[PDB]
């Protein structure tokens, strides 16, 4: 039912309408390509405002009702896991291939034949990248050059003023949670937090877990060096419910009786802490003045009002268990850590619980500081691609010169190999060459230079001057040859860019009809 | 079906216009308030008539007006930072930023890229910042000269305010407060009492950190060697008459009804009657460089605005003690920076020259607006200052008194260096954000 | 020129709205002012010529036009006369500004120029004025009497005028003090009797009765003001009274009497023999049980009194407000020699308390009359008498009427502008021409030619003095000094002072912003 | 003086539009070439010009490009004089066709 | 271009006569700049004769003679050196006949 | 107004306006002098034209039907 007022769009006009939808998303994002990319203003539905030039953040907030655009947005969920930084390179390359395809549809070529040529040209280009690539840490694991690559990555963000410090912590973090020989770095083990105040130079690495929760009392010991941590659901006091106790005291006859039973539970459980051997007792709820008065006499620090997911992470990081009640305590359910400190922030009373391991760990949290929350927000994503830059180099130290050098070199190989394909896919291979040029031609445009003159000037330099590829000086540095500028992109990233771009073009080309029923 | 049902997107052609039209509108809104001869403005909320008011404060106009455009909200938030942080330059930041975008829209019309504009403005802001640094004048010795500069800076901040008529009396109050401080510029130690009665000229002063609160019913009018315990006892909540006599029997001063600032200020810092009210006067306190300024007016609306403009003077004056450098106002600093940019335009690549030329014109439009609002021929005065600064004479400015050009040093007009510095940087940083934007995205509102 | 941005449209928008309010109120100027018809929304219609009443019943919505309405209220508080002349002067200055702004003159230059004309204007009126002696009660009587003849009541002025002269001279030191408080002289009135029956009481007089209290007299009373309501126990929060039997029901009455008496015992300790209960309607201000306990303590009941009536009692006897019985003390008490409630034929049940014996200078006037209107106009006339007399205390001088101050002001300002330099010349000349709207309006209402009247008077002022002004009683130009038609100096000075400040304020409006 | 300063800049700005139009018609970036000549002549180098052959800036003395002095003098005077006549006019009186 | 800018100045409340006062002063400084930049040749007539070829190459630009402009630079300069008198070109005849390329032009 | 004030405050003899942007006012120094018969007929012809126009209140012309 509901055939009446059903939206429909079919025929060759639909394919050109689908291409027009993808070009709108590519032309929107090609301006934000490169370090000199133009930002994008976001107007949140709740009245909030932010500014950023991140390709992934633009696609996430872009509310597009067109179905072809939603597929292009879904590619970001698969691309950011591998590359992280240049999701724009896939959308710009996808929209470029679709624009050049529109010239081939007029010639009378089927869309599937166009997709067959791009898949053939992608293997030509992907094969070319494996040749001109270069290694950094071949056969030895080292930390000197690996830190330098991340320092150029954060320079593209607002945190460029403090890009040199965060790169060292990024290498120790990934090397801590996983070994380079294992080649298995998990982002789930990595967490990033922060708070307003200070500067980005105060970024620190905490091997363990950090939660914005304070001790049960300021008179508690500020250092739990021994590795015995109890993690209960209730505090060591008379048991209370989750919402409200509502004790019924009619007169003094009940007060002196219940106070004895209550005081007995105060002494029984507070002394049970040293029975099981636990020094620190982390609890979901807070402690009463009678409890903290007894904790101080026993030198038993404890944490109050710890959150739901915070109690879970402390058990995982310290290696303990979420104890449901004190009766289930045991030597095995006590957590492990080397030093527990309470770290305040100037005049603010945050006092986050800092659980240090005093050794190499398997999970590490990243604490960020700064004078603005949105700059701290953009600072968090600035490390996410750095984790991918480090993770990509760990999976394969082989890399290709960025700044558009790879795209211009592949375009020459794709163009020459097109002569060897006597079939209608030849026009698509030449279209793949011109589409590859849009990434570097977009960088020069965003920097304020003549695109085509800077494009072809680097082509002849890549053909006449020398065989090693040369990029575009978009930062207005001395000259080309980005190897001197140390602007190098990963090999797995460039291969996933051309791969995800060809897939996204293949999916949109094999679609030729959209149907949806309207409001009856 | 790209963006429908509330969700909208402005393309590069339209978003380039909406980004500037939103920001330029806020500049043209409150540019008339610039200068001592600033034009007033009525504020009347829709749906209610009791919200009528009239003012010429560029900061007060931006706080109350609502903003739906995101480009304008950035420029307004960057202006409110100047009012809360620095206390002066809220209007110059909004005008200087908007005039830069107005010129930038003419540059992009000439097919000049926004990134090419930003490169020139970064080099111009360095040369412009270097001009103030060379022309700035500090005063380590000669406290009389340094005291005179604080009086001139106080008049500039109080210009185009409610207290502009009797500024000669308030210049002695604000400067004496900061002069008596002579150290850390914590404005917490500078209390401002507000009491009814008397004209603005009747504003008294007390160096013993006078208080705006009366205590108890029958308290002692003098206590020797009092030990302060805030929670002599001081409490924010009121003290009932029963515990008062218990403290009275112990000779403890039962202070009641303290506010948040009272606990925050008294921690670091006799009975006195000013304005028919019992006031708490301290003396010989540890770090006794504090003080209090006693305002006097007919109602509270007079005293509220008296506290705002006066606090704005204490902000820059406190900043003048931390940084004794001063620069000449009245279009001298704005025109001097604009001259260095034009000199920098001689040694620069091609497109950066045309962009830096617009940075200078935006600075020259500040005295043009100060002269236009005063009714003088701005094209004659401003163009005369160019010929003045171009051949030496780095002191000429606008004489709003007579309506001509005169040496700002002789006339006694000067402003702080950190104020003009932040005004230059906050305006350039604000306009830099708008040019980097090329497409506004609006999702379906809830 | 291009003139892309046009903020001047808001000036013409504010000037037109400001000039509109003046053009309506112009015809109602003077004794021969043409009446105006106001129709309420319900259907009622009324006729009047008082410019103050017309502005209130206009429902002005524009901001600039509201400034003229609030301006007229400032003249009433300060001077009490010339309310209509102020709005007419402001409308003509703004209309004159419309000619200057078209010539390319800035509002700030126009604003600063008008202040110079105001500074020289006050010197012109003050030089040509007639000083008088304030202690001389002969000049004050004829001054208010002749002025009251121009008011509504022309026959009973000779009775109410000297009542106000003595009332001011009594509480104000003659020829020593410069400021006067009209609130220090309360005016009570009741139906019955006639205007001839009046009493200038040295103490205070109220209107409410002390019933059902049976004391009726308390000598040597220490009057006190308590705002908290004295009654049985009451709680705003959710509560419930417990009653086990008829004994507990009757016991609560014994405990209810205690709660009323416990607060009275604290009042008895201070010696407060008379209590001023603030008027309250949200709850029982004084229950029935409180009456007998107050009668036992020999306290007079004074309740349902207005705050303004308490304000007159504040400065009269020096009583302070007490918001709670716990804060009630002896230092916050007034005084009184002999308290009593008098009930005469026409004066009604008045609370006459004499012999305050406290620092203060106050009096009170008792009034009688057949109808409400007969007593209403009596109190309205006493205010204008007190207002015009107040104008003489601050400014001990007199000046002629008939718009003669506006002609001497306009005549000499044109000569003053010839000596000035710059834009101030045309700005001050326009200030002079604007003053001519007042006498031309008086001449129009008197049936004369508006031009030839002011044109003839400008020659009589160049040759003569300010005595030449329009006389509407005879219907032509005459020597106003002989007609005894004068007004105090504060009316003409405060008019130019407050009107020019409003014109300067309206000129400085560059635009209006709608907030939310 | 004040107002005359603004009129002089428009006179210089008009002269700068001649190499702008020569570069625009040739297809080169006129904003870079003309702004580079301005930066050049402002600090020495009173022989720089446009190179339409190569599409860049070069020394006119070396390349061998020059024009007569009497020609440029008349172009400057005939243009300012012709513009002076039009700028001085404020009302046009059209008569009846015959 | 002067009038295009003058139209903008008139919109800025600038009088036409005030603009003419600036253009007259500007025309003086412009002529003075040409004289300081002008370089005559009192000696070295070969350098002068070389310059006359540059005047012909600059004047003959944007014409149909671009195919053989280098030939016409010699003819026009050669015929001028023969005159050595007033600029009256009535003494210099011109012939227009078909046949042959532009480089075949005789003198 | 500045010239008029100079004709009273500065000095009683008449002073003109410096329209050619010469040294200063006082055209007697600049040697700019008009004939007395010129000014007498200038304001006389101007007044006579104003009276002739003010004394006309009807311009009647028949139209073509």
> What is chain B's length?
446
Q: How far is E32 from chain B (nearest CA, A)?
A: 21
What is the b/e burial string over A180-212, where b = at least 16 CB atoms within 10 angstroms of the residue's CB?
beeeebeeebbbbbbbeeeebeebebbbbbbbe
DSSP 8-state assignment for residue A201: G
Chain breaks in chain E (C to N over 2.5 A) after: none
Q: B119 — phi, psi (to 5°)? A: -65, -45
Closest Cα partner for B247 from B223, B273, B214? B223
> What is chain F's length?
65
Distance CA C270, CA C325 (A): 11
Cα–Cα distances in angstroms (integers) from residue A62 to residues A174, A231, A384, A508, B17, in the given order = 31, 42, 20, 19, 21
Structure tokens at B57: 């404060």
Distance CA A330, CA A222 (A): 25
| Residue matched to tokens 């107040």 | C390
**Alpha-helix residue ranges (DSSP H) falling in F1-65:** 2-5, 27-30, 36-54
Count of other CB atoms within 10 angstroms of residue D14: 20
| Element holding B441 (H helix, E strand) | strand B437-442
DSSP 8-state assignment for residue B137: B
CB pairs under 8 A between C and F: 20
Interface of E with D (CB under 8 A): 1-6, 8-9, 12, 14, 16-27, 30-31, 34, 37-38, 50-51, 54-55, 57-58
The answer to whether A113 and A444 are in contact (CB under 8 A) is no
Distance CA D74, CA D68 (A): 10
Query: What residue spans define the domains of chain A?
Result: 1-136+398-520, 137-207+362-397, 208-361
The answer to whether B335 and B128 are in contact (CB under 8 A) is no
Closest residue in C to F10 (Cα) is C419
Closest Cα partner for B61 from A50, C509, C60, C69? C509
Distance CA B186, CA A519 (A): 65
Closest Cα partner for E26 from D7, D85, D87, B380? D7
Given strand C321-322, what is the order of strands in its sheet?
C300-305, C274-278, C223-226, C321-322
13-32 in chain B: CB under 8 A from chain C: 28-29, 32
> What is chain E's length?
107
Structure tokens at A400: 């290709």
Closest Cα partner for B329 from B414, B240, B224, B218? B414
In chain A, DSSP finds a helix count (H) and a strand count (E) of 17, 15
CB-based contact, E64 to chain C, within 8 Å: no
| Residue matched to tokens 């919109």 | E11
Closest Cα partner for B438 from A454, A22, A446, A65? A446
Distance CA A283, CA A237 (A): 11
Cα–Cα distances in angstroms (integers) from residue A476 to residues A32, A86, A186, B116, in the given order = 17, 20, 37, 11
Closest residue in C to E6 (Cα) is C1
Chain breaks in chain B (C to N over 2.5 A) after: 231, 269
Distance CA C338, CA C432 (A): 60
| Annotated binding-site residue? E62 | yes
Q: To 10 degrees, what angle do helices B417-436 and B300-322 make? A: 100
- Chain C hits for E11, Cβ within 8 Å: 1-2, 4
Distance CA B175, CA B178 (A): 5
Catalytic (active site) residue C84: yes
Q: How far is D42 from chain B (nearest CA, A)?
A: 6
Looking at the domain B8-138+324-444, which fold is it? GROEL; domain 1 (1.10.560)
Distance CA A333, CA A230 (A): 7
Beta bridge partners of C349: C343
Closest Cα partner for B157 from B317, B37, B39? B317
Q: Is B196 exposed, middle or buried (0-12, 13-18, 19+ CB in 10 A)?
A: middle
Structure tokens at A82: 């591998």
Q: Is C172 exposed, middle or buried (0-12, 13-18, 19+ CB in 10 A)?
A: buried
Distance CA A194, CA B281 (A): 45
Q: To 10 degrees, what angle do helices D2-26 and E2-11 make? A: 140
Resolution (A): 3.1
Peptide bond into B61 cis (omega under 30): no
Distance CA A121, CA A421 (A): 10
Distance CA A352, CA A211 (A): 5
Cα–Cα distances in angstroms (integers) from residue C104 to residues B437, C97, C107, C512, F3, in the given order = 40, 11, 10, 22, 19
- DSSP characters over A334-375: -B--SEEEEEEETTEEEEEEEEE-SS--S-EEEEEEES-HHH
Q: Which residues contact D89 (CB under 8 A, 6 or more apart)?
A: none
DSSP 8-state assignment for residue F25: S
Cα–Cα distances in angstroms (integers) from residue C167 to residues C201, C375, C389, in the given order = 9, 18, 11
Distance CA C496, CA B159 (A): 26
**Residue C435 C-beta-side C-alpha neighbours within 13 Å:** 29
Distance CA C391, CA C496 (A): 15
The answer to whether C17 and C65 are in contact (CB under 8 A) is yes
The answer to whether B51 and B45 are in contact (CB under 8 A) is yes
Instruction: Say whether C476 sits in a helix, a strand or coil.
Output: strand
Beta bridge partners of C187: C365
Instruction: Say whether B351 sits in a helix, a strand or coil.
Output: helix
CB-based contact, B43 to chain C, within 8 Å: yes
| Residue matched to tokens 């006309």 | F56
**Alpha-helix residue ranges (DSSP H) falling in A396-511:** 405-418, 425-436, 438-447, 451-460, 482-485, 491-510
Region of residue A227 (left: phi > 0; alpha: psi -120 to 50; beta: else) = beta
Q: Which residues contact A17 (CB under 8 A, 6 or more apart)?
A: A9
The answer to whether A65 and B3 are in contact (CB under 8 A) is yes
DSSP 8-state assignment for residue C232: S
The answer to whether C454 and F44 are in contact (CB under 8 A) is no
Beta bridge partners of C199: C366
State yes or no: chains F and C have 3 or more CB pairs below 8 A: yes
What amino acid positions of A are annotated as catalytic residues? Answer: 54, 87-88, 385
Work out the end-to-end distance of chain A between its first and last CA atoms, rounded to an integer number of angstroms. 10
Work out the end-to-end distance of chain B between its first and last CA atoms, rounded to an integer number of angstroms. 19
What is the b/e burial string over C420-453, where b = at least 16 CB atoms within 10 angstroms of the residue's CB?
bbebbbbbbbbbbbbbbbbbbbbbbbbebebeeb
The answer to whether A177 and A190 are in contact (CB under 8 A) is yes
Structure tokens at C168: 């001011």
Chain B: touching chains (3 or more CB pairs < 8 Å): A, C, D, E
Cα–Cα distances in angstroms (integers) from residue A519 to residues A513, A514, E20, in the given order = 20, 16, 70
State yes or no: chains A and F have 3 or more CB pairs below 8 A: no
Distance CA E65, CA C278 (A): 111
Structure tokens at C366: 């008792």
Q: Which residues contact E10 (CB under 8 A, 6 or more apart)?
A: C1, E16, E19
Distance CA D90, CA B378 (A): 25
Q: Is B255 exposed, middle or buried (0-12, 13-18, 19+ CB in 10 A)?
A: buried
Instruction: Say whether B259 sits in a helix, a strand or coil.
Output: coil
- Is the C-alpha dihedral spanning B301, B304, B310, B312 positive or negative? negative
Structure tokens at A245: 């106790």
The answer to whether A439 and A86 are in contact (CB under 8 A) is no
- Positions of E strands within C21-75: 36-39, 45-48
Structure tokens at E84: 């050595």
Beta bridge partners of A194: A368
- Positions of E strands within B67-225: 190-196, 204-206
The answer to whether C48 and C36 are in contact (CB under 8 A) is yes
| Element holding C227 (H helix, E strand) | none
- DSSP characters over B204-230: EEETT---S----SS--S--SSPPPEE
Q: To 10 degrees, what angle do helices B70-85 and B12-30 make? A: 40
Instruction: Say whether C468 sits in a helix, a strand or coil.
Output: strand
| Annotated binding-site residue? E101 | no
Closest Cα partner for B392 from B344, B339, B347? B339
The domain covering B139-213+281-323 belongs, at the CATH homologous superfamily level, to: TCP-1-like chaperonin intermediate domain (3.30.260.10)
Report the alpha-carbon angle B55-B57-B62, nearest 5: 100
Structure tokens at C30: 């003077």
Instruction: Kindly report the three-state secondary structure assignment for every residue of chain D.
Output: CHHHHHHHHHHHHHHHHHHHHHHHHHCCCHHHHHHHHHHHHCCCCCCEEEECCCCEEEEHHHHCCCCCHHHHHHHHHHHHHHHHHHHHCCCCCCCCCC
Closest Cα partner for E30 from D38, D57, D74? D74
Peptide bond into A419 cis (omega under 30): no
């Amino acid at each position: 039912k509901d055939q009446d007022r059903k939206s429909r769009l079919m025929g060759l006009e639909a394919l050109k309408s689908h291409i027009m939808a993808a070009k709108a998303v590519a032309n929107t994002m090609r301006t934000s390509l490169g370090p000199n990319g133009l930002d994008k203003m976001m107007v949140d539905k709740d009245g909030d405002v932010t500014v950023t030039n991140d390709g992934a953040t633009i696609l996430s907030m872009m509310d597009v009702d067109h179905q072809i655009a939603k597929l292009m947005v879904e590619l970001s969920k698969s691309q950011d896991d591998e590359i992280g930084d240049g999701t724009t390179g896939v959308v710009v390359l996808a929209g470029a291939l679709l624009e050049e395809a529109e010239q081939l549809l007029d010639r009378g070529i089927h869309p599937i034949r166009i997709a067959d040529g791009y898949e053939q040209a992608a293997r030509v280009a992907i094969e070319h990248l494996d040749k001109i690539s270069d290694s950094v840490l071949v056969d030895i694991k080292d930390t000197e050059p690996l830190i330098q690559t991340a320092k150029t990555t954060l320079g593209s963000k607002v945190v460029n003023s403090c890009h040199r410090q965060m790169a060292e912590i990024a290498v120790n973090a990934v090397l801590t949670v996983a070994d380079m020989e294992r080649r298995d770095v998990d982002f789930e083990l990595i967490k990033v937090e922060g708070k307003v105040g200070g500067r980005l130079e105060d970024t620190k690495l905490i091997k363990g877990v950090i939660v914005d929760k304070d001790f049960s009392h300021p008179q508690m010991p500020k250092k739990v060096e021994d590795a015995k941590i109890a993690i209960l659901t209730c505090p060591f006091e008379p048991p209370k419910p989750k919402t409200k106790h509502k004790l019924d005291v009619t007169s003094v006859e009940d007060y002196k009786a219940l106070q004895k039973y209550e005081k007995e539970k105060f002494e029984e459980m507070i002394q049970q802490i040293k029975e099981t051997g636990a020094n620190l007792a982390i609890c979901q709820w807070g402690f009463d003045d009678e409890a903290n008065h007894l904790l101080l006499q026993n030198n038993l620090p404890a944490v109050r009002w710890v959150g739901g997911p915070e109690i879970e992470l402390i058990a995982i990081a310290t290696g303990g268990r979420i104890v449901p009640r004190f009766s289930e305590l045991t030597a095995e359910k006590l957590g492990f850590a080397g030093l527990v400190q309470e770290i305040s922030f100037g005049t603010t009373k945050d006092k986050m619980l800092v659980i240090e391991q005093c050794k190499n760990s398997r999970a590490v949290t990243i604490f960020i500081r700064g004078g603005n929350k949105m700059i701290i927000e953009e600072a968090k994503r600035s490390l996410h691609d750095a984790l991918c830059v480090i993770r990509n180099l760990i999976r394969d130290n082989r890399v290709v010169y960025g700044g558009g050098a790879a795209e211009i070199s592949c375009a020459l190989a794709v163009s020459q190999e097109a002569d060897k394909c006597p079939t209608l896919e030849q026009y698509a291979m030449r279209a793949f060459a011109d589409a590859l040029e849009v990434i570097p031609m977009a960088l020069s445009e965003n920097s304020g230079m003549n695109p085509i003159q800077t494009m072809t000037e680097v082509r002849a330099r890549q053909v006449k001057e020398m065989n090693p590829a040369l990029g575009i000086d978009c930062l207005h540095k001395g000259t080309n040859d980005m190897k001197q500028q140390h602007v190098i992109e990963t090999l797995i990233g460039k291969k996933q860019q051309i791969s995800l771009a060809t897939q996204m073009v293949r999916m949109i080309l094999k679609i030729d009809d959209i149907r949806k029923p309207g409001e009856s | 079906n790209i963006f429908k049902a509330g969700a909208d997107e402005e393309r590069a052609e339209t978003a380039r216009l909406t980004s500037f039209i939103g920001a330029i509108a806020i500049g043209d809104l409150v540019k008339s308030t610039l200068g001592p001869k600033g034009m007033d403005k009525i504020l009347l909320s829709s749906g209610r008539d009791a919200s009528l008011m009239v003012t010429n404060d560029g900061a007060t106009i931006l706080k109350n007006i609502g903003v739906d455009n995101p480009a304008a909200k950035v420029l307004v938030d960057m202006s409110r930072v100047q009012d809360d942080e620095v206390g002066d330059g809220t209007t110059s930041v909004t005008v200087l930023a908007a005039e830069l975008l107005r010129e930038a829209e003419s540059l992009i019309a000439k097919k000049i890229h926004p990134q090419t504009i930003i490169a020139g403005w970064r080099e111009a802001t360095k040369a412009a910042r270097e001009a103030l640094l060379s022309s700035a004048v500090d005063h380590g010795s000669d406290e009389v000269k340094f005291r005179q500069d604080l009086m001139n800076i106080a008049g500039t901040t109080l210009s185009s305010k409610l207290l502009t008529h009797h500024k000669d009396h308030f210049t002695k109050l604000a400067v004496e407060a900061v002069l008596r401080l002579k150290g850390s510029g914590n404005l917490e130690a500078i209390h401002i009492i507000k009491k009814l009665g008397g004209s603005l000229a009747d504003s008294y002063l007390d160096e013993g950190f006078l208080l705006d609160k009366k205590i108890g019913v029958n308290q002692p009018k003098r206590i020797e060697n009092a030990k302060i315990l805030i929670a002599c006892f001081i409490n924010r909540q009121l003290i009932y008459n029963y515990p008062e006599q218990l403290f009275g029997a112990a000779g403890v001063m039962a202070i009641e009804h303290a506010d948040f600032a009272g606990v925050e200020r008294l921690a670091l810092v006799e009975e006195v009657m000013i304005g028919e009210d019992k006031l708490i006067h301290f003396s010989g306190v540890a770090l006794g460089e504090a003080c209090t300024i006693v305002l006097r007016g007919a109602t509270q609306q007079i005293l509220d605005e008296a506290e705002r403009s006066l606090h704005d003077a204490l902000c820059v004056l406190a900043q003048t003690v931390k940084d004794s450098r001063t620069v000449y106002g009245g279009g001298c600093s704005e025109m001097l920076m604009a001259h260095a940019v034009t000199q920098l335009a001689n040694r620069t690549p091609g497109k950066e020259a045309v962009a830096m030329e617009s940075y200078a014109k935006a600075l020259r439009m500040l005295p043009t607006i100060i002269a236009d609002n005063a009714g003088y021929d701005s094209a004659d005065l401003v163009a005369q200052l160019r010929a003045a600064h171009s051949e030496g004479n780095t002191t000429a400015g606008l004489d709003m008194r007579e309506g001509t050009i005169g040496d700002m040093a002789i006339l006694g007009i000067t402003e702080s260096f950190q104020v003009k510095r932040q005004v230059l940087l906050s305006a350039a940083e604000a306009a830099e954000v708008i040019l980097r934007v090329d497409n506004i995205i609006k999702a379906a509102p809830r | 020129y291009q003139d892309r941005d046009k903020p001047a449209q808001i000036r013409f928008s504010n000037i037109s709205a400001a000039k509109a309010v003046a053009d309506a109120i112009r015809t109602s100027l003077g004794p021969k002012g043409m009446d105006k018809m106001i129709q309420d929304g319900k259907g009622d219609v009324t006729i009047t010529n008082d410019g103050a009443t017309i502005l209130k019943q206009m429902q002005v919505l524009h901001p600039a036009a509201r400034m003229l309405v609030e301006l007229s209220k400032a003249q009433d508080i300060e001077a009490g006369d010339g309310t209509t002349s102020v709005v007419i002067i402001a409308g003509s200055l703004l209309d004159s500004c419309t000619k200057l702004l078209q010539k390319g003159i800035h509002p700030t230059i126009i604003s600063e120029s008008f202040q110079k004309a105001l500074e020289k204007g006050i010197e012109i009126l003050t030089d040509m004025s007639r000083p008088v002696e304030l202690s001389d009660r002969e000049t004050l009587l004829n001054s208010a009497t002749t002025s009251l003849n121009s008011k509504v009541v022309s026959q009973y002025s000779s009775l109410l005028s000297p009542m106000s002269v003595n009332a001011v001279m009594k509480v104000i030191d003659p020829a020593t003090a410069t400021s006067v408080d009209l609130r220090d002289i309360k005016i009570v009135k009741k139906l019955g009797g006639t205007i001839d029956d009046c009493e200038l009481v040295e103490g205070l007089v109220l209107t409410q009765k002390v019933s059902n209290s049976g004391i009726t007299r308390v000598e040597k009373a220490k009057i006190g003001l308590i705002q908290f309501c004295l009654s049985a126990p009451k709680t705003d929060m959710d509560n419930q009274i417990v009653v086990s039997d008829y004994a507990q029901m009757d016991r609560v009455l014994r405990e209810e009497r205690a709660y009323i008496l416990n607060l009275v015992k604290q009042i008895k300790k201070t010696g407060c023999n008379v209590l001023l209960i603030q008027k309250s309607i949200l709850r029982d201000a004084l229950s029935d049980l409180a009456l007998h306990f107050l009668n036992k303590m020999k306290i007079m009941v004074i309740k349902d009194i207005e705050r303004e009536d308490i304000e007159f009692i504040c400065k009269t006897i020096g009583t302070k407000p007490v918001a709670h019985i716990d804060q009630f003390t002896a230092d916050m008490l007034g005084s009184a020699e002999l308290a009593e409630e008098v009930n005469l034929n026409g004066s009604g049940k008045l609370l006459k308390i004499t012999g305050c014996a406290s620092p203060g200078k106050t009096v009170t006037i008792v009034v009688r009359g057949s109808n409400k209107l007969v007593i209403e106009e009596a109190e309205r006339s006493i205010h204008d008498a007190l207002c015009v007399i107040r104008c003489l205390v601050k400014k001990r001088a007199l000046i002629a009427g008939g718009g003669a101050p506006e002609i001497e002001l306009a005549l000499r300002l044109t000569e003053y502008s010839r000596t000035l330099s710059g834009m101030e010349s045309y700005c001050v000349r326009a200030f002079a021409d604007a003053m001519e709207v007042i006498p031309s309006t008086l001449a129009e209402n008197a049936g004369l030619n508006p031009i030839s009247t002011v044109t003839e008077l400008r020659n009589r002022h160049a040759q003569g003095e300010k005595t030449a002004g329009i006389n509407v009683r005879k219907g032509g130009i005459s020597n106003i000094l002989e007609e005894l038609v004068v007004q105090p100096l504060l009316v003409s000075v405060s008019a130019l002072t407050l009107a020019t400040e409003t014109v300067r304020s309206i000129l400085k409006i560059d635009d209006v912003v709608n907030t939310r």
